[PDB]
C-alpha cells in the first residue's frame, strides 16, 4: 500500500502530490523549462487558407511543456474572448485535456454537465495544468484513465480497455487520454431535474479502426463536417494531434515501445527505480530515452531523425501547395457561377486530401513514430488535391478562366488576408479579456483554494501575440 | 595463401574453382532453384507506356537467380534476333555484367575494344553465367571489382575506390559491380592499328553524387536522354536496378550492413566460417539474414517487411497511372497540332516525374533497403506527373478537346497496343534466332571448351513467353 491510501485531499493540484513523491514532483514540474513557443501559421502560411473559416487560421502553435498546457488554452486565440460563463466560441469540451480538473468536475457533476456549456463556463474551478490527477489513482498511485471516453474508443476499435491492458500498454494508454484525434459529439440529454440539455461530448473516431482511411470513413458515413471552408465551401474535417493513432503503427508501436519509454525514460539507483517525469523532447536526452535499446553516436541517430523530417517537411509543403490552390480555385469557380453540382466531386477530393495531409502532420512526432505512413498519407494527400485540381481547371474553363492562378500565400499576413482574419481585431478582444475576466478567474481559483499562485510562476510570459522576454 | 596461388586455368568457368572450394560452389549453384519468371510488363502495364518507344516495353521480368543471368540475357526480347555478329538492335555492353567471361575478354582484348560493337559480337565467347570470377580474385581468392567503371564512378562521386575500401565495404562493392543505375556513353577511339571505333561504354551517373536528383542533375547537364518517348515524344531517362544506390541512403546501409550479410550469410561451424553463396531472398533464410541482429518472431519481421511492399505498391500505381496518361494526353495535343514550345514544360515534367518513379522501383528491394526514400521518390514523381497533367488540360483545351480521356492500359495486351509493340512478330523472329544461330553460339563455345554443358541443365525452360513446365 502508499502512504496516502485512504486518497489525497485536495488532489487535482499536483502540489498536493509533493509530500509523497518528491522526486517525481520536481521531475513533473520541470516541463516548465519547454517554453518555446513556434508559431506554426508563421512557418507554414499554407495551414491558414486550408483552415480558412475555421479558429485554427487564427493561432495554432507547436505544442511545448505541460506546464503551460493551460495558460495556452487560455491565451490561443481560438478560445476567443468571452465576458462571461455564458459567452465564447468554444464549448467547454475544450478543456478535457489540459487539466487535473477536469476529472475533478466530472466525478463531481457527472460526465454530461461537464460536456455542457461554454468554454467560460469552467474558468474559475478548471485551473490546475497537466497533473499527477491526470494519470494516477490518488489512493495506489496506479496508472489510471480518468477520461471515459478512451476506453469507448478502445473499445470501439476492437482493442482491449484500459483496466483490461497489460502494463507496457497502459503506459502509452496514460497519454492517449489526451494525445488522439477526436470530434465533439453533439449529444441530446436530460438532467436529475428534468431539464433539457445539450451536450458536446470528446468522441474518438475509432469505430472502424484506428487508420487514417478507416476514421475517414467514420466520417463521411455520418456526413460530419467540422466546419464549412470559408473560400471553397467544402465541408471540411479538422485532424487534431493522433499522436497515439499513428504510433501505434510505427514500428515502436509495433514492436511495444511505448510513449514512457522514450518520453519519461528510467534511471536506476540502486533497487529504486525512477521515471523522468519532465516530458519533453528524447534528443536531449539519448542516453536514456534511446542508447539503452540502439548501440551507436547519439549523433549519428540524431542526424536519422533530422532526415526523416526533411522528408516530411518535403512532402508537406507539396501537398499543402495544392491543397491550398485547391481551395482558392474552386472559391474562384464559386465567383463566376459554379454550382455546387458542378462542384462535389471537387469538393469530395478536397476533403478527403486535407483530412489525410492534417493527419499525417498534426502529430507532430509522427514523422518520427510512424515515418513511412505519414509520407504515404501526405503522398496521397497531394493525389486528392491534384485530382481536384485537374478537374478544377475544366469547370474554370467552362467560365471562361482557364488562365486563373490562385493567388500566393508564402506568409503568414498574406494568407490571412485571404481567409478573411481580422487578426488585430481578435488580438485586441483577447487582451481585453485576459486583463479583466482571465484575472478574475484567477482570483477566485485562488480564493476558493482551487488554485496555488506558486503554478503561475513564468506560465504566462509568451503566446504568439505577446512576448515579456522569457518564461 | 591459396591451393592455387598461380592462379586457375579456365578461371571464367566457376567449375575449375570447385576443386578448390567445394562448399561455396554447392551453394553457389543452388540459385538455379530461383528459376520463377514474373512478367513485370503483365503485373504493371503502366510501365509499358512508361517505356513505349523503348525494348523495355517489350519484355521485361523480375530478377531471377544468377544461374540465369546469362541466359535470361539472351532469352530476353530486347536483345532481338540477330542473325550474325553485326547485327541485333543491342551493343556488346549488354553482356558486361551477365558473365565472368566479361573481365576474361576485357583483360583479354581492352576495354574500349569489349564495349565495341553489337551485343551478337560475343555470342560464342560470353558463355558463362555469374560466376566466382566475377568477384574473386584466381590466386588470392580474394574480393576484387573486375570492372573499371566502378572505381571511376566511386571516385567520381567522392567515395574511396575499390581497394581504398574496408573489407565490410567490399561485400557490398563487389555486388555494386553490376547491381546499380548506368547508361552507356558513346566513346570514339582509335585502336592499335590506327583505325578509327566508337564504343558504348558503361557509365555510372554519379559524378554529381549518388542520389536520384543529383543524377537527373547529371543527365540534364548532358541534355542525354536513353530514347524519346514513342508516345509523348519526350526526351527520356530509364533507370536501371540502382540497388547499391538507393541501399547506400537507406539505415541498413547507414548502418554498415553489407549486402552480404543478408544475402550471403555466414554460417560458424567451429572455427571456419562458411557464406552461403545461394544469393536469394533472405526472407527464406532469416534465422541466417535477420536474426542475428534483431530479435523477435520471423513472422512478425516478415509481416512488417510486407507492410512495406504494400504502401510502394500504393504509391507506385499512382504515380505509374498518371505518367502513363501525361505521356498519352501528350500525345494526343501533339495530333491536334499542338507544338514543341508548348509541350516542352510539360515533357520536362513527364521526364523528371519518370525518371523519379522509376528510380525508386528499378531497384526490386528498394522498397526494403531505403523504405523511406522510394515512397518520397515516388511521391515526387507523382507531383511532376500531375504537374504536367494541369498544364496538358490547358494545352487540350486551347486545341478543343479539354475533356479528352486518355485510354485504359490495364492489361499488358491493351497497353503493348497503344505502345504499338507488335509481340507475335518479335517472338516468331526471337524463337527463329534462338533455334538457329543461338544454338551454334553453345555448339561453338562448348567445342573450343569456353562452355560446359552441364552448365546449361534446365537453364532455358522457362522465359516471359514460354514455359517448358519446370526448371
Ligand atoms: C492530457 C491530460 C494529456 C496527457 C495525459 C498527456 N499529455 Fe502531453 N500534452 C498535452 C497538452 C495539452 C500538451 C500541449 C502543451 C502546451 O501548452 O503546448 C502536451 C504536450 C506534450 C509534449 C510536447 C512537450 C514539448 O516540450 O514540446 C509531449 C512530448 C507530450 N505532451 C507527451 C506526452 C506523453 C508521452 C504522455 C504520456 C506519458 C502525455 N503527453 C500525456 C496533454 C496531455
Ligand atoms: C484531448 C482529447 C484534447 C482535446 C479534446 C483538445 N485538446 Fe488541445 N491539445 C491536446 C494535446 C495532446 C495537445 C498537444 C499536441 C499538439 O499537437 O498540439 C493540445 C494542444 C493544445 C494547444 C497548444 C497548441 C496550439 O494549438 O496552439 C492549445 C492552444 C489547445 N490544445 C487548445 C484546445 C482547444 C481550444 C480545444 C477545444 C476545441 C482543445 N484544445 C481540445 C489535446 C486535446
Ligand atoms: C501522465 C501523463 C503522468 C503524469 C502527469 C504524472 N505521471 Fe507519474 N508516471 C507516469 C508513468 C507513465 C509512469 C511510469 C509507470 C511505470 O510503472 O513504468 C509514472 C510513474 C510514477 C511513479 C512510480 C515510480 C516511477 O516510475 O518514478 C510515481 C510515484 C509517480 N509517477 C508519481 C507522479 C506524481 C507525484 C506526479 C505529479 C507531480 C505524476 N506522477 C504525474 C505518468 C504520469
Ligand atoms: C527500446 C525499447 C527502444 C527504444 C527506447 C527506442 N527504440 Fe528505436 N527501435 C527499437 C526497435 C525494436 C526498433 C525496430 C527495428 C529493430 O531494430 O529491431 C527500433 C527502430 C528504430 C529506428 C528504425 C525505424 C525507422 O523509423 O526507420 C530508428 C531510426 C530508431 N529506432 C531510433 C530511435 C531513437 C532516436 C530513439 C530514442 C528517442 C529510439 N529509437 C528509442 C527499440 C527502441
Ligand atoms: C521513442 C521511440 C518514442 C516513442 C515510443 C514515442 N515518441 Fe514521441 N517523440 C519521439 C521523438 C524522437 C520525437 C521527435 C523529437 C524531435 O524534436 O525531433 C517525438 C515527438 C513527439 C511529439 C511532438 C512534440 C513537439 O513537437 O513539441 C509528441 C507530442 C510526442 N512525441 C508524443 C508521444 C506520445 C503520446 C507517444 C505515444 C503514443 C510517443 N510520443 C511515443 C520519440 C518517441
Ligand atoms: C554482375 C556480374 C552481378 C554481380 C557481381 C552480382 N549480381 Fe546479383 N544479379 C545480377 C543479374 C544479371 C541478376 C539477374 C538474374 C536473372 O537472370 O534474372 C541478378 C540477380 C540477383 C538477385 C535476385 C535473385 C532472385 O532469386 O530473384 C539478387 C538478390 C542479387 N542478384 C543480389 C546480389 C548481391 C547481394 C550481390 C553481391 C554479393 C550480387 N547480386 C552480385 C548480376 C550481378
Ligand atoms: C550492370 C551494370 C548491368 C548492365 C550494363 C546491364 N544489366 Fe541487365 N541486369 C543487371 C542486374 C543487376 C540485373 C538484376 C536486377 C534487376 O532489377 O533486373 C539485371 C537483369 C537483367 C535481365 C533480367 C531481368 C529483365 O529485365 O528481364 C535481363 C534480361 C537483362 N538484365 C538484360 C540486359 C541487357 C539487354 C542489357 C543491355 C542494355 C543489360 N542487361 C545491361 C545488371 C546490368
Ligand atoms: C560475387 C557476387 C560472388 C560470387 C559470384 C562468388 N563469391 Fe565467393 N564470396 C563473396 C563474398 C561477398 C564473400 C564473403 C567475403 C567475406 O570475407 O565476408 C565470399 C566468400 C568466399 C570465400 C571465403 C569463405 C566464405 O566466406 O565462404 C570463398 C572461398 C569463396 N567466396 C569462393 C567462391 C567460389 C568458389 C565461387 C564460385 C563458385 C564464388 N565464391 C562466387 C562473393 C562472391
Ligand atoms: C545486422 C548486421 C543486421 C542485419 C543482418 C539485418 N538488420 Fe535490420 N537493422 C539493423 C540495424 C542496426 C537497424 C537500424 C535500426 C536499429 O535497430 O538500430 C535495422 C533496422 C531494421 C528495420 C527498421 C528500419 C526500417 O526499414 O523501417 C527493419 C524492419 C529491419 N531492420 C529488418 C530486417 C530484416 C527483415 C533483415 C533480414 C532480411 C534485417 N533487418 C537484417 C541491423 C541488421
Ligand atoms: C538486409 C538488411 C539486406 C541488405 C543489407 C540488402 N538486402 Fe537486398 N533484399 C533484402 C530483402 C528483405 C529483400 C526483399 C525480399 C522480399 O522478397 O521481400 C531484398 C531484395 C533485393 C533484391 C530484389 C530481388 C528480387 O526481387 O528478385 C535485390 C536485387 C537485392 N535485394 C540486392 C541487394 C544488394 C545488391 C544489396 C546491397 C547493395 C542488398 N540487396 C542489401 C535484404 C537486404
Ligand atoms: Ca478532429
Ligand atoms: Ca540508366
Ligand atoms: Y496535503
Ligand atoms: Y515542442
Ligand atoms: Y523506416
Ligand atoms: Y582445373
Ligand atoms: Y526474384
Known sequence: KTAHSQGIEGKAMSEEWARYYPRQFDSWKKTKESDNITDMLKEKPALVVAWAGYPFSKDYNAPRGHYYALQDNINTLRTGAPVDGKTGPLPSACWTCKSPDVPRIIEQDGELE???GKWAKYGDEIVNTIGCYNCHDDKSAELKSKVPYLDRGLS?????????????????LVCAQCH???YFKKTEWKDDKGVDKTAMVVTLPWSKGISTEQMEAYYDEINFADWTHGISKTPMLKAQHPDWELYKTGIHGQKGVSCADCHMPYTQEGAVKYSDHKVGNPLDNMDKS???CHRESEQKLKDIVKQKFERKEFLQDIAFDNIGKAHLETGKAMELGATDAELKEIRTHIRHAQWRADMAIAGHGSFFHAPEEVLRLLASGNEEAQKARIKLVKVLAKYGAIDYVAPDFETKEKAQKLAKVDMEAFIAEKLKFKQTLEQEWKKQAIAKGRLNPESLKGVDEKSSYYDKTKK
Open 290 to 292: 534511446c542508447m539503452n
Open 114 to 116: 461537464y460536456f455542457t
Open 156 to 172: 470501439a476499435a476492437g482493442f482491449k480497455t484500459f483496466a483490461e491492458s497489460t502494463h507496457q500498454e497502459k503506459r502509452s
Open 180 to 182: 488522439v484525434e477526436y
